[PDB]
Amino acid sequence: SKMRDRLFFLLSKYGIRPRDSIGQHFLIIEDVIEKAIETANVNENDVILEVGPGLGFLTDELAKRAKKVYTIEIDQKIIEILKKEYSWNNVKIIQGDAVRVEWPKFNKVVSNIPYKISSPFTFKLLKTDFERAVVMYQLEFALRMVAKPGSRNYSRLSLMAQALGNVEIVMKIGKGAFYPRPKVDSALVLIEPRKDKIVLNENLVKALFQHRRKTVPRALKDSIHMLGVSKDEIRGIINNVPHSNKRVFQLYPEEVKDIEEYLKKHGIIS
Numbered sequence: 001s002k003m004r005d006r007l008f009f010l011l012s013k014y015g016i017r018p019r020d021s022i023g024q025h026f027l028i029i030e031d032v033i034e035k036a037i038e039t040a041n042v043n044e045n046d047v048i049l050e051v052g053p054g055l056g057f058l059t060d061e062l063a064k065r066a067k068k069v070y071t072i073e074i075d076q077k078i079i080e081i082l083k084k085e086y087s088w089n090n091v092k093i094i095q096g097d098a099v100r101v102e103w104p105k106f107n108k109v110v111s112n113i114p115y116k117i118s119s120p121f122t123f124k125l126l127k128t129d130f131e132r133a134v135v136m137y138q139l140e141f142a143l144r145m146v147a148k149p150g151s152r153n154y155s156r157l158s159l160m161a162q163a164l165g166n167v168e169i170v171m172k173i174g175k176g177a178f179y180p181r182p183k184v185d186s187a188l189v190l191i192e193p194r195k196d197k198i199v200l201n202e203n204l205v206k207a208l209f210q211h212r213r214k215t216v217p218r219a220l221k222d223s224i225h226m227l228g229v230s231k232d233e234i235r236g237i238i239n240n241v242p243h244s245n246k247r248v249f250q251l252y253p254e255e256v257k258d259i260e261e262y263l264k265k266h267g268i269i270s
């Protein structure tokens, strides 16, 4: 393992630990890096966003092919290492939490995504304008992203992915491709924005999917009551909601949109 050795050499050169966070797993196989890049069709005109460059193995490959790369890294020591170890003309390193910082404009994402931020990063991405995202997640998370309405793992993530994106698992990635080796496989995921998006009210979606096992009427009565309004105000309106015979985890985007329009009509959503 050429690149695994390079990892050990760099780690010890700067005397740094393999992880700043329990879920840090460096991508250390060149063919997986190149597969991600080729899946994304990275070319000389692309502006790329990466999150968590680590010791910069994917960043390096991106920089050779892309017009510009923005890479977001929380750890200042990692950043110092990237700056000393590489010579790129076309990489802007953004210090901070990728979930919290403002993103530059980009047309593509090519990134390994730490599991700890997989969910908030993906919700943020789905709300941005991009042409294509090729990202690596833990396999179970990727399977959540492509779950179908009514499956056990269909969640708010699944709904928004279906509503806003076209998502494909391109392949599994073995745990052998990272150091340290994770306990589970990863997956390479391709995301493109839907041309005809189903744009859903985020507060409604969160309210419904708080307790996704609940019936649609119960989920709404409970969530709206907890906002601070009397049950008496909303009981009859909620009892006549469309798709009331479903549990929330069975709802298609199209059905959530119906609920939203009904709720706006009845003064429950502003």
Ligand SMILES: NC(=[NH2+])NCCC[C@H](N)C(=O)O
Pocket: 039, 166, 168, 169, 170, 190, 192
């Ligand atoms: N495994 C893959 N490369 N799948 C490619 C999907 C391409 C995508 N649906 C598009 O509209 O461009």
Ligand SMILES: O=S([O-])[O-]
Pocket: 022, 023, 024, 025, 115, 182, 183, 184
């Ligand atoms: O701790 S690693 O398996 O995300």
Ligand SMILES: O=S([O-])[O-]
Pocket: 060, 086, 087, 088
């Ligand atoms: O090509 S990278 O090593 O600056």
Ligand SMILES: O=S([O-])[O-]
Pocket: 172, 173, 174, 175, 176, 185
């Ligand atoms: O493909 S998993 O079994 O490493």
Ligand SMILES: O=S([O-])[O-]
Pocket: 123, 124, 127, 160, 202, 205, 206
């Ligand atoms: O996309 S919103 O539901 O976080």
Ligand SMILES: O=S([O-])[O-]
Pocket: 228, 229, 230, 233
């Ligand atoms: O909260 S009021 O509408 O009874």
Ligand SMILES: O=S([O-])[O-]
Pocket: 254, 255, 258
């Ligand atoms: O069933 S809803 O799309 O009218």
Ligand SMILES: [Zn+2]
Pocket: 020, 052, 053, 054, 073, 074, 075, 078
């Ligand atoms: Zn980091």
Ligand SMILES: [Zn+2]
Pocket: 030, 034, 061
């Ligand atoms: Zn190469």
Ligand SMILES: [Zn+2]
Pocket: 140
């Ligand atoms: Zn689980």
Ligand SMILES: [Zn+2]
Pocket: 210, 211, 212, 213
């Ligand atoms: Zn619950």
Ligand SMILES: [Zn+2]
Pocket: 225
């Ligand atoms: Zn009460």
Ligand SMILES: [Zn+2]
Pocket: 242, 243, 246, 255
């Ligand atoms: Zn329905």
